[PDB]
Symmetry: D2
Subunit: 425 residues, 4 copies
Amino acid sequence: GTAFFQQQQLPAAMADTFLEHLCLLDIDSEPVAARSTSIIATIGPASRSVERLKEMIKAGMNIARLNFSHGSHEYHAESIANVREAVESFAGSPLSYRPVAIALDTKGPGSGPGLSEQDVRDLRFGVEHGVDIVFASFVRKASDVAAVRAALGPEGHGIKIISKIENHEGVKRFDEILEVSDGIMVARGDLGIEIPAEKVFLAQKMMIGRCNLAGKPVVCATQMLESMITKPRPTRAETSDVANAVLDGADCIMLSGETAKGNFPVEAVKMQHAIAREAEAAVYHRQLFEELRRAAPLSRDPTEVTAIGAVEAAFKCCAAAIIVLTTTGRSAQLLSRYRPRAAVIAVTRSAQAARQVHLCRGVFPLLYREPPEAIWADDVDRRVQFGIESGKLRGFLRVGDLVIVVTGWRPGSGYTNIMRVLSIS
Amino acid sequence: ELGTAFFQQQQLPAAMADTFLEHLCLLDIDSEPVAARSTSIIATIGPASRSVERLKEMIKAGMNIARLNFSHGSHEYHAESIANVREAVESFAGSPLSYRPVAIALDTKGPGPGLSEQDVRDLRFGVEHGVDIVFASFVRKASDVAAVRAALGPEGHGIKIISKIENHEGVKRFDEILEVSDGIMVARGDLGIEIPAEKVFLAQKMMIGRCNLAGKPVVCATQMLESMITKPRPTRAETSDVANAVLDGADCIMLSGETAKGNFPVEAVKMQHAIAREAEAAVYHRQLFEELRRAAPLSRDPTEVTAIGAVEAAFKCCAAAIIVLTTTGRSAQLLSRYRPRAAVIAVTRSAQAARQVHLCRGVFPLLYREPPEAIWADDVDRRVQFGIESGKLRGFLRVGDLVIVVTGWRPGSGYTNIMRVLSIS
Amino acid sequence: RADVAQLTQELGTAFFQQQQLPAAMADTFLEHLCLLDIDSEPVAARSTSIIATIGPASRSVERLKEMIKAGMNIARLNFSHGSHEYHAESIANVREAVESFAGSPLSYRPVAIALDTKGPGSGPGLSEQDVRDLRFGVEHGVDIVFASFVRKASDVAAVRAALGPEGHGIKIISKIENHEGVKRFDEILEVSDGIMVARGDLGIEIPAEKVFLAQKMMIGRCNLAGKPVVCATQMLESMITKPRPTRAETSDVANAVLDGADCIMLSGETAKGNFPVEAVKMQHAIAREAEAAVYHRQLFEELRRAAPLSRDPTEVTAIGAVEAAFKCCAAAIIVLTTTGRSAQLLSRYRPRAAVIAVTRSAQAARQVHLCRGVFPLLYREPPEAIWADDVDRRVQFGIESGKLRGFLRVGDLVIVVTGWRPGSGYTNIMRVLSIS
Amino acid sequence: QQQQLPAAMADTFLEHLCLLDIDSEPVAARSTSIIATIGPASRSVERLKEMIKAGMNIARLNFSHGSHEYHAESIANVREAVESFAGSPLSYRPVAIALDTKGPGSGLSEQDVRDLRFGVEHGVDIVFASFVRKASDVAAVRAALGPEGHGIKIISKIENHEGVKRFDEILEVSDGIMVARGDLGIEIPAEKVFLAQKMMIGRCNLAGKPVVCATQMLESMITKPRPTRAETSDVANAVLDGADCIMLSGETAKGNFPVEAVKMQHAIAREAEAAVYHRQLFEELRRAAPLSRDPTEVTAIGAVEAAFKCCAAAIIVLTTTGRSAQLLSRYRPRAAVIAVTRSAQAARQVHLCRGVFPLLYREPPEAIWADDVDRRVQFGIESGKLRGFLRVGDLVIVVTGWRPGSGYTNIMRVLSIS
Ligand SMILES: O=C1c2ccccc2C(=O)c2cc(S(=O)(=O)O)c(O)cc21
Ligand SMILES: O=C1c2ccccc2C(=O)c2cc(S(=O)(=O)O)c(O)cc21
Ligand SMILES: O=P(O)(O)OC[C@H]1O[C@](O)(COP(=O)(O)O)[C@@H](O)[C@@H]1O
Ligand SMILES: O=P(O)(O)OC[C@H]1O[C@](O)(COP(=O)(O)O)[C@@H](O)[C@@H]1O
Ligand SMILES: O=P(O)(O)OC[C@H]1O[C@](O)(COP(=O)(O)O)[C@@H](O)[C@@H]1O
Ligand SMILES: O=P(O)(O)OC[C@H]1O[C@](O)(COP(=O)(O)O)[C@@H](O)[C@@H]1O
Ligand SMILES: O=C([O-])C(=O)[O-]
Ligand SMILES: O=C([O-])C(=O)[O-]
Ligand SMILES: O=C([O-])C(=O)[O-]
Ligand SMILES: O=C([O-])C(=O)[O-]
Ligand SMILES: [K+]
Ligand SMILES: [K+]
Ligand SMILES: [K+]
Ligand SMILES: [K+]
Ligand SMILES: [Mg+2]
Ligand SMILES: [Mg+2]
Ligand SMILES: [Mg+2]
Ligand SMILES: [Mg+2]
């Protein structure tokens, strides 16, 4: 229908130049797709109540950040328990349940150059409490990441390390830090004090570009909706900053004081949700996909080869979704790196992977709870059907839509190799 | 890894170029072709090439399609030539490395306001003798194609109709002719008499471009190696013409007097084979694939969606082949329209489809004769392994290579929707 | 590497590490982003004009001199506040501060005066206060009018009529502040001299999360039309009370410049805030960084592809001059102009080279601040007897002022744009000159 | 519309091909020069006049055949035929004289030294140097031309594997290149010649140096009045590849249809030039051309850009050595580059550059240099109007310098005709 091609900035998406794409942007072209940039909300006094956390999950919070620069271990353990209680209150309806990751943000090393003794204790707390992600403060070189990895021990091998780049050295040694990290956070608060304030946008755009090229998650953080700590509506510069972080290519956007101590934590999450949806529809996919394809090197890994084939197939038919089965989240991450317009519905049995895939733009995790079928092919199908049924209930899919299904040839992680075109019935 | 020597062969340095101009500058006479020749050679069978022994040499030199010119000879003469082609083809039905399907094409005498009486009788002869293709002379409009189609009677609706464009009217009404035809022949001999000789190259390039866009076979014909009718080596203009027809995007190249009446029919086939191999490696795939992608409209047909995904996947890993299961040849044709560098190995149970897929550039037919397996999934596996084993035998594949496999979810033609990445064991 | 090797040996590796030149050479926008370097210092003069609202904190002659030195190019008078007497005193103080630097072309900096109207209310036509304020503007010789709540082409015709026969030279910049203005944008742009994305009211009239779409669309369409576009309101809002802005604020200023805005504005930051000079300095610092980060390769190609063919010699000469400037890394394009039009046509192709506009019109020197990258030089000398000698003196004036202001250095190449006969509308010549 | 303008507007090369129309007639003057080998079949003054009218721009003398006396008579006949049209200065066509050497045997041969000296003594404009395999071969030819042959253009013939492999060093010291396909097709596999031709044409286009496509282009026309389909395609594809010149050997030297062979190359080249996809070509030439601080180079790109913006009918350039016209030509404008020169040698040599139309200025000098420049500009306009290049109302780009003498081009002006 003509109405379909007038929504989600589709006239602007057809444009032959980026300039014509901008000229075709329409404020009356409503967003259709689900919001794909994850929202990280920092947990504090304004956001610890189980009932308030349920409202934040419904507003769109995907990752709960625990800032270990404030509070004690006892305070953060209660935060974790309240988050888990609010999250599990929706587990009774498995088709609508929303996993929420728990990220520990470290205090950092201060005047010290190595891992501080408090960071070692906080990192061991994180492993003991089952955190999914570590936002490592003031990462300046690859050996800082190795020290964080060592302090997590053998039981914290699955935790994702997102390196916070907050000073000149971190920016200059970016490539070596990215290589050993799972992702990056553009920590603009300290970065804007360590380097001239007028240069932060260059560092943000450079880091987001490099992370997009590497296929690794990148978080844009600090003062995105600062005025919403005390005011019900943000400034024009604030909404523009959120939209531009999404247009830059950020996988995640963050709220600090806006959710930790402000008077409008739920409204701040709703605002980031609303802006991100508008900005994602305004992304010029024609140039973005072409450039991501061109820049990505050749690969002999079947997961990587299947992912590019699936993204290309999704664009060819305007697929509503790519449903992928994943153990560690890696197959969903490799789909996400090509920035499909189609939602990547990741079906997993790993509760940790379901939480961690929120770091990847456009990945919608579904935690499958059913016990395995005796016939492996029947177990793969029931999981694909669970992805379809959840997608229909959540509005991602409708009867008649085309979907791309990404699976593997045998059980266990690392064997994704099949892409299939499926019609929704 | 593949090694530096791998990336110096088959014009791979020129293939990596960021502009067409840089691509030309990087062409290297020392960069040897490795891939199998993908542009089919059509040889006209006549006095100089009728004998079974001579036909065996032409099959070994590279002839894929035997053309019978019904402007000369008689039904009895052409029936003997067809029987001799079939005898030469079946002489290799033992050795798997040597059995190659050869299509039989009937070229009509031509047209009054409809089909000539002799054309009606010759078309009936073609149906009775089981020809695969009809090269229809002097097609001027869509109703000329309908008359040939009607003449192919109740038993020959599977015969491919390749319309010969030989006059101003055929060029002007090209779009309507292409729409109802299976493919096109740029019949340069008569075209060069009907329109100014200096305009033929415009008509050839236009028709090849439009056929490439439509995903339909296009043949470049007449005077390609003309001087080889009397001389053992062609002129510099002749080798250039063959190379340029391949670079233009022709699916097939033809020999007329060169093979029908000249003194060097086998040498003419060998020469076209040598030039086509060199010219295919010099194709600028980066721009070609991007432009085929951009120009091709969105599709909700799973075969078309799977084909673009499979070709994208093949480029990502430098796949040695795309093995496709096809009954009518359509799935192989849809892969061929995206011009993959990988060979498209079409595994079929149909002898007719195996002969007819020679019209599509880069399609290597394998006729499969084993009795069916009771379990359909096992029968599919048996054919995929037939394609892999034939490939290892013919040189295409080695253990450790990656191949793309294209199948459907259920038996019967028209359900292609799966693309799998396999590692050769 | 081969397309920059000879110029790299000549100008040096240090030259090609500054002003985001490695990022400028990139073959894709993604590679361009990856190559952005915080250690690559900006060298070029700041080309996006700063509009500062003059009010209680920025009114004194001494304070205004500090703001002119910090980078203010256009002084905005908000007729939603104050009185005619109050605004006349502000204008006189701006003119006194501006004329305190008139002793030499090396120290002189023309500053435009813009009147921002109160607007219509529930009425669908020009208000009686707007008619009186517009007549005040003509009587006080304002250069620009920022017309509030423009909703259709007839609104700009009403403003034009209220300016009378003596206000024909005043530029009308239509403020787009509601859904109707956005929807009827094309007809408004066609009859306006430029546009202002007035984000404060726009953010109340349409959903706040959609303002960025309207800003990017309007900037893109203005860039395509070759007409000035201003980005306004809350750019450095927190600097009204704090000496440093938020991370969202610096990002917003940089992104308005990257979007393609010709001007950026300060409202409460300079009108009532505690750091008016620091707010101007901050916009100046961010704009210089953001201009160097512009991906000129894609921008120039897209401006070329989208712009239709032209039989106007000024337009033909402008594209040739900008192409020539990119080929040699010209330090400047010196253009002779009467109305500012030849400089505006150069500016629409977004050259990296500074467009030094040499003019005798004091009003045109003030108004060309609306066009990104235009540096106005007011020529005060009486005409030479031979017109060709007069033109040559004006060209040399621009070269000597350019050398003394640091825009030009010995060994630099400059592009000179002039016409074949006197009077407006005859630009048709492009010359390549080496600086000695 | 005419001159393949619908196909020129296309957003992709594939859509450009699809839009090519056999009914879209060429309007622009033929840009690719024709080199005709002068021999027994084309030696007479009367025959040479018909070849000049058919489109011959460069006369090639093959020093592998004949004698010095034979070639001197051929040269005199060419000059006599050329000067028979000098009575009408606004339509006169300069014709270059090129000497093609016999080549080495195993260094520069003694016969080549004598033939090169003959060329200097007879005032040849170009030398097609046979079997160039390294930069030192070009230096030897240059030295054998002596101090009086400093102005002769050396076009290196690439005819073997070594010449192809050492191409970059040969191009660096040569004025241009000839893809000598006859010997190249014997020295390397015949099926690889097209790769060497396309690579060499691409590199010459990038370097801004003339490239000639030669041998067997219309071979069958030695005995037949019409060429084969492969032959017309080969000529069209050499033009589409980017060749500045196309050549005729036996077709004009010993064949039965020398005038028809020239007419055929003229007809094909005109059609192929209109089918060039300028949108991609200009952008790629621009992207690849390095940054430059040379005002002639800077003015040339500005002039070509300005010509495309207004669909200028021509770029009129004043040139002493032909260099300013060559720098315009390297950007492949659709507009004709009308080169107004006082140098008869430069007028002949500038035929090596695609799209350059030389006008030999023989009008009286004006007293004031500025007035003299303006009259040379008006001469280009009047010749253009008479020859069909220009009409009243057209826009032209005029390229001049700031002071007399070679090397000072720095001005581009936009002018409306009449
Ligand atoms: O002499 C021919 C002949 C004689 C007797 C029976 C058949 C043939 C025959 O098929 C043929 C085809 C071509 S062409 O390549 O189609 O032009 C010829 O040029 C010449 C003959
Ligand atoms: O208090 C103000 C004032 C008081 C008395 C006379 C004039 C002014 C005045 O011009 C102004 C402008 C702005 S704004 O930047 O336009 O929003 C303000 O925010 C506040 C004032
Ligand atoms: O993305 P990952 O972690 O590599 O997981 C993908 C794996 O998931 C599967 O699709 C399903 O495997 P399981 O049945 O073990 O869940 C495997 O075939 C595939 O290898
Ligand atoms: O190219 P075609 O003619 O549509 O054939 C493709 C068909 O071949 C298959 O892959 C195998 O089918 P069969 O087992 O019937 O041969 C089907 O799943 C698919 O529909
Ligand atoms: O930019 P504008 O308003 O068109 O003015 C450009 C004009 O200035 C000139 O360069 C010089 O004109 P004046 O001598 O009248 O100042 C003219 O040749 C040209 O027409
Ligand atoms: O192309 P070339 O050899 O540099 O010649 C261009 C020269 O011709 C001119 O346009 C005219 O000079 P002359 O008066 O010497 O003929 C010069 O201004 C310029 O330097
Ligand atoms: O630590 C942080 O989040 C910061 O510095 O912005
Ligand atoms: O009929 C043909 O083959 C021709 O005319 O080229
Ligand atoms: O009028 C204004 O400046 C606004 O609305 O932002
Ligand atoms: O000498 C030549 O011209 C050749 O060999 O092609
Ligand atoms: K912290
Ligand atoms: K026939
Ligand atoms: K106002
Ligand atoms: K010779
Ligand atoms: Mg910090
Ligand atoms: Mg025919
Ligand atoms: Mg307002
Ligand atoms: Mg030779």
